[PDB]
Amino acid sequence: PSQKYNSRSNRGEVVTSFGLAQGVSWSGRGGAGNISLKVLGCPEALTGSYKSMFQKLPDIREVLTCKIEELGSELKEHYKIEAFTPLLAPAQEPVTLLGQIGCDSNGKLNNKSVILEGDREHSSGAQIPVDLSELKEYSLFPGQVVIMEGINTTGRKLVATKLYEGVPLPFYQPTEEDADFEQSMVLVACGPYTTSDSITYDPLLDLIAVINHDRPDVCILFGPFLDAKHEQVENCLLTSPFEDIFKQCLRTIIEGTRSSGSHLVFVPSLRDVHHEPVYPQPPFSYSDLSREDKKQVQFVSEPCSLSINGVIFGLTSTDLLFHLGAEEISSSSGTSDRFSRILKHILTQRSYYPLYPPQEDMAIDYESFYVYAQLPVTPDVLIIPSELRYFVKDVLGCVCVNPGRLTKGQVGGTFARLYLRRPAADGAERQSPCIAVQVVRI
Amino acid sequence: TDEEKYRDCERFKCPCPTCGTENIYDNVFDGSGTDMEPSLYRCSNIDCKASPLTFTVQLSNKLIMDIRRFIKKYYDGWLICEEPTCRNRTRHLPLQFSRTGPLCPACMKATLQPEYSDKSLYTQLCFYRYIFDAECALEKLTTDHEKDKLKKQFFTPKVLQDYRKLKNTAEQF
Ligand SMILES: [Zn+2]
Ligand SMILES: [Zn+2]
């Protein structure tokens, strides 16, 4: 088993650095002082009080229309558009159309298959193909709400001449108290936590040692903890209930890190076999906690917008990057950074999962999605662990971190550490509270 | 009628942790009248003397695996056109609805129907609950003698617990 992993020699290697990574001892004060963890949300009062337990198509339709209409209403105000024309109304003069990008087939989107599906309010949900030959720049993906300008003389095709750019949400405006927070160190890690050939969770034990040594203020651990895709889980070869193995994993971490004084924040994954398989997911259920542990452990949902010492964190365990990246089409020149484009889409579509339809096997309850998977504000930090290579990019003023997985196959993975401290109030506003980030090898 | 209600449902399959042969379950009981034994009493492989009742843990884990599969199948949202000449298949729900539902974007005169309906999923879950509802399979016996001889022979308080457990594996999700 885990032979390869335990014999690794890269241990501790810093593979990526962001900010003033040097000038900070990657040590937290442990449990010391004021640590304020608040879960954020997007209120809502549009949804009815009688829900069925299996989605009705008319309900999904409703959520998708509102997605278009709601964002379109904001974009229209921002770009001072005067009027949206119905997609099927032919005109000789240029028109401004609002709709959702889509593909005309079940395949990958390409510069010839783009279609624009209109909102119900203006176009009764009609679709029209879009010609991109005259479009100089564009980045599109299925599900993307956009405002396009072009010529549609017959009413059966839009020759796009302009694609308005996405507009992000404002950042969280800190209160005065938030400026009174001391520096905090946050560790981030995502599963799997065991190599693909063993169930020894050696990487997990190593990560626990790290937490105790560095004693970070907060640890955000993303699932899977008991991976549904692990060979031994899938073949039902295990000799204990899934729920029990899961609790043990949690126990090991909660107990094994008691001395560090770090606050643990557990985020579920759609791959956690024992847990609800539909997205968005509710928090894990774990009651076996002392009253001390209860002040040290937190179970949040997936996705989750979390405030840590005034700093807003966008958290998702779902591989949105890999999913969106596989379906996006672009065109400019070639000096473009793919991931920055994808991250820009996440920050401009205001959702933790804008891709629609979703990757095939991602189950989404759209009515829940509407209520719990929207972005409340443009986060200060976005943690999007992916199968893609680890990285740390600043996109639209948001530090986006992909700490990668802790384990990749039979080889060791990586995790990440951030240093935070919200700066002094005045000056050209945006002063990222995130001072430095590092992606380290486990 | 229970036989027809669960006629199209997928049967619960789980391989013997010992001999390896795939056992199939469709009812609490196996066989008829007098030689009726709880299906979970013996392996289907006659050269395996392991009792499935001994691997309740492995069965529960398998049910979870299966139940996930069905819920994910339902949520994939595959839609298929009702027009035999079209049969367009998509996972993209069109915002353009006709009087009876999504309008097929291929032919523009037919409605798209869910490939795996919510009623099929619900029936499937009810089936997985029915094949382990021992109390119910026993109340479906006319004579209290047939039942109690059986209740005394195989359904001890512990075995009844095992069945209740599997039967409720359904709501963990
Ligand atoms: Zn057997
Ligand atoms: Zn059709």
From Swiss-Prot, chain A:
Tagged with keyword Phosphoprotein: yes
Coiled-coil boundaries: none
Superkingdom assignment: Eukaryota
GO biological process: DNA replication; DNA replication initiation; DNA replication, synthesis of primer; protein import into nucleus
Protein keywords: DNA replication, Nucleus, Phosphoprotein
GO terms under cellular component: alpha DNA polymerase:primase complex; ciliary basal body; cytosol; intracellular membrane-bounded organelle; nucleoplasm
Disulfide pairings: none
PTM info: Phosphorylated in a cell cycle-dependent manner, in G2/M phase.
Gene Ontology terms for molecular function: DNA binding
Cellular localization per UniProt: Nucleus
Assembly and binders: Component of the alpha DNA polymerase complex (also known as the alpha DNA polymerase-primase complex) consisting of four subunits: the catalytic subunit POLA1, the regulatory subunit POLA2, and primase complex subunits PRIM1 and PRIM2 respectively. Within the complex, POLA1 directly interacts with PRIM2/p58.
Family: Belongs to the DNA polymerase alpha subunit B family.
Its biological purpose: Accessory subunit of the DNA polymerase alpha complex (also known as the alpha DNA polymerase-primase complex) which plays an essential role in the initiation of DNA synthesis. During the S phase of the cell cycle, the DNA polymerase alpha complex (composed of a catalytic subunit POLA1, an accessory subunit POLA2 and two primase subunits, the catalytic subunit PRIM1 and the regulatory subunit PRIM2) is recruited to DNA at the replicative forks via direct interactions with MCM10 and WDHD1.
Free-text note on domains in this protein's UniProt record: The N-terminal 240 amino acids are sufficient to mediate complex formation.
Protein name: DNA polymerase alpha subunit B
Organism: Homo sapiens
Section covered of the full-length record: 157 to 598 of 598
Curated annotation (Swiss-Prot), chain B:
Region described as DNA-binding: 1-109
CysA-type Zn finger ranges: 16-51
Binding residue positions for Zn(2+) 1: C16, C19, C43, C48
Cellular compartment(s): Nucleus; Cytoplasm, Cytosol
Record: residues binding Zn(2+) 2: C81, C86, C104, C107
Extent of motif CysB motif: 81-107
Domain of life: Eukaryota
Note: In eukaryotes there are five DNA polymerases: alpha, beta, gamma, delta, and epsilon which are responsible for different reactions of DNA synthesis.
Domain-related comment: The CysA-type zinc finger is required for PCNA-binding.
Similarity comment text for this entry: Belongs to the DNA polymerase type-B family.
Subunit relationships: Component of the alpha DNA polymerase complex (also known as the alpha DNA polymerase-primase complex) consisting of four subunits: the catalytic subunit POLA1, the regulatory subunit POLA2, and the primase complex subunits PRIM1 and PRIM2 respectively. Interacts with PARP1; this interaction functions as part of the control of replication fork progression. Interacts with MCM10 and WDHD1; these interactions recruit the polymerase alpha complex to the pre-replicative complex bound to DNA. (Microbial infection) Interacts with SV40 Large T antigen; this interaction allows viral DNA replication.
Job description of the protein: Catalytic subunit of the DNA polymerase alpha complex (also known as the alpha DNA polymerase-primase complex) which plays an essential role in the initiation of DNA synthesis. During the S phase of the cell cycle, the DNA polymerase alpha complex (composed of a catalytic subunit POLA1, a regulatory subunit POLA2 and two primase subunits PRIM1 and PRIM2) is recruited to DNA at the replicative forks via direct interactions with MCM10 and WDHD1. The primase subunit of the polymerase alpha complex initiates DNA synthesis by oligomerising short RNA primers on both leading and lagging strands.
Involvement in disorder: Pigmentary disorder, reticulate, with systemic manifestations, X-linked: An X-linked recessive disorder characterized by recurrent infections and sterile inflammation in various organs. Diffuse skin hyperpigmentation with a distinctive reticulate pattern is universally evident by early childhood. This is later followed in many patients by hypohidrosis, corneal inflammation and scarring, enterocolitis that resembles inflammatory bowel disease, and recurrent urethral strictures. Melanin and amyloid deposition is present in the dermis. Van Esch-O'Driscoll syndrome: An X-linked recessive syndrome characterized by different degrees of intellectual disability, moderate to severe short stature, microcephaly, hypogonadism, and variable congenital malformations.
Protein name as it appears in the record: DNA polymerase alpha catalytic subunit
Organism lineage string: Eukaryota, Metazoa, Chordata, Craniata, Vertebrata
Gene: POLA1
Parent sequence residues shown: 1268 to 1440 of 1462
